[PDB]
Amino acid sequence: MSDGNVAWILASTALVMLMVPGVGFFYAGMVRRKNAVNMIALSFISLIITVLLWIFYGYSVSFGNDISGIIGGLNYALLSGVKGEDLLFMMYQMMFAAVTIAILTSAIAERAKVSSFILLSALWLTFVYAPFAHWLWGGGWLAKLGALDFAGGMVVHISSGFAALAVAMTIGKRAGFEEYSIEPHSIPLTLIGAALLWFGWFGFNGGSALAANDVAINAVVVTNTSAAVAGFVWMVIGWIKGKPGSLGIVSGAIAGLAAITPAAGFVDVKGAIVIGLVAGIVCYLAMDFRIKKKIDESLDAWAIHGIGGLWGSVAVGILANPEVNGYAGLLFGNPQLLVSQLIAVASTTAYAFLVTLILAKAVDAAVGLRVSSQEEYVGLDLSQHEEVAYT
């Protein structure tokens, strides 16, 4: 199987798994002390629930026998018939799902019932994630019309980003959101999460070539490039508006990482530089805008991942360099790729937002998404986990 290739993907899988709690730490540092445990716990739960559902039927629904090009059959339920390298792919893909669910927790920070999140997550994984994976990577209709997504610009970032926006709108602002700022209880904790996310992204984008080859190497180069550019942009903006806070710096880096994800294996360093530069700017604008509109999409999964993934997914159609991976974009003489990307981006963006909206309201109506005001007041660590973060 090429031990080298198996080695790299085994490693990449471990790396993406680390990103799940990595998201938890990243988010936890930004919420109040009384909700720190909850924020982290959500990422671990996201991992646990994802592994089970993926095995049970999630994998099959994403990559099983195609039906009308919109979803896969149940031929791989309980991994029936999944062997050898297919097992590794299943496992690697399983982790992409988990990270996606964790990113989404941005929209429910400090005020959701754990039980409700689990229910919603299970439904979302079933009706939004699996379909997307199938459409783009499971031989679905989007792949058929030529759409590309190297590492999940759409499958992972647009989905969680826009789903987060829908969820935030459904669950409502946190008490005191408009009145006064919620201060991050531990920026260092968030920076630890940020370090784990950058590190794990090596397996995320680099492992998406599914081999230890020139494409993986390219993905690693441009991934770091876009991250550095977007992080530099936010640093500049930070200075332009005051002082460069560390949160803005790593938030910018992540914008660049999300934007390059769908294009990591198709563009060159120059293209990577454009992608990161634009990502830094548009994502910052997106953040400012949702803030202006007073939407409590708390940790900016939308502005960063949603918008970053949207831009990067479209950028693929403009900058794909055939000398890099055969595929060519607009600037390389091929208008068709751009149209495939726009269709894919338009489709995934609308579906993620609208369907999540339906699922969120459904669950809210069925069991209620938000915790009581008093639980929100005492904090979810105590009220939802009967634990205290620090003593």
φ/ψ of 210, rounded to 5, equals 60, 25
Which residues contact residue 141 at a Cβ distance below 8 angstroms, ignoring those fewer than 6 apart?
69, 70, 135
Under 8 Å between Cβ of 46 and 20: yes
Give min distance, CB of 120 to its own copies, in A.
16
Indicate whether 242 belongs to the interface with its own copies (CB under 8 A). Answer: yes
- Residue 67 parent element (H or E): strand 66-67
The residue from 109, 128, 227, 287 that contacts its own copies (CB under 8 A) is 227
Q: Which position among 73, 94, 302, 342 is part of the footprint of its own copies (CB under 8 A)?
A: 94
Site string for its own copies, 22-51 (x = CB under 8 A): x-xx--x---xx--xx--xx--xx-xxx-x
Q: How far is the CB of 366 from its own copies (least distance, A)?
A: 18
DSSP character string of 115-146: HHHHHHHHHHIIIIIHHHHHHHHSS-HHHHTT
Residue 391 is a binding residue for its own copies (CB under 8 A): yes
**Bridge-partner residues for 66, per DSSP?**
72
Q: How far is the CB of 4 from its own copies (least distance, A)?
A: 2
The owner of tokens 């995320």 is 204
> Is 328 within 8 Å of 320 (Cβ atoms)?
yes
Query: CB of residue 133 vs its own copies: minimum separation in angstroms?
Result: 18
Asked if residue 277 lies in contact with residue 315, where contact means CB atoms within 8 angstroms, the answer is: no
Instruction: Establish if 236 lies at the interface with its own copies (CB under 8 A).
Output: no
Among 139, 145, 245, 357, binds its own copies (CB under 8 A): 245
Q: Which of 35, 116, 170, 186 binds its own copies (CB under 8 A)?
A: 186
Q: Is 291 in the site for its own copies (CB under 8 A)?
A: no
If binding is defined by CB under 8 A, does position 265 make contact with its own copies? no
* Residue from 211, 295, 343, 362 in contact with its own copies (CB under 8 A): 211
Stretch that binds its own copies, among 235-243, 305-313, 327-335, 365-373 (CB under 8 A): 235-243
127 binds its own copies (CB under 8 A): no
DSSP H/E element including 72: strand 71-72
Residue the block writes with tokens 């180069």: 221
Of 246-254, 292-300, 314-322, 349-357: span binding its own copies (CB under 8 A): 246-254
Candidate ranges 90-98, 123-131, 159-167, 307-315; the one touching its own copies (CB under 8 A) = 90-98
Q: Which is nearer to its own copies, 147 or 263 (CB)?
A: 263
- Residues 134 and 72 sit within 8 Å (Cβ to Cβ): yes
Angle at 190 between CA 186 and CA 194, to 5 degrees: 165
> Contact between 224 and its own copies (CB under 8 A)?
yes
Residue list 100-119, contact with its own copies (CB under 8 A): 114
**Residue 370 bridge partners (DSSP):** 112
Give every CB contact of residue 133 below 8 A, 6+ residues apart in sequence.
Answer: 62, 63, 93, 96, 97, 155
- List binders of its own copies among 314-333 (CB under 8 A): none
CB 109 within 8 A of CB 35: yes
- The verdict on 199 binding its own copies (CB under 8 A) reads yes
- Between 186 and 356, CB nearer to its own copies: 186
- In sequence order, the 6+-apart residues with CB closer than 8 A to the CB of 28 are 36, 37, 39, 40, 186, 189, 190, 193
The distance of closest approach from Cβ of residue 234 to its own copies in the complex, given in angstroms and rounded to an integer, is 10
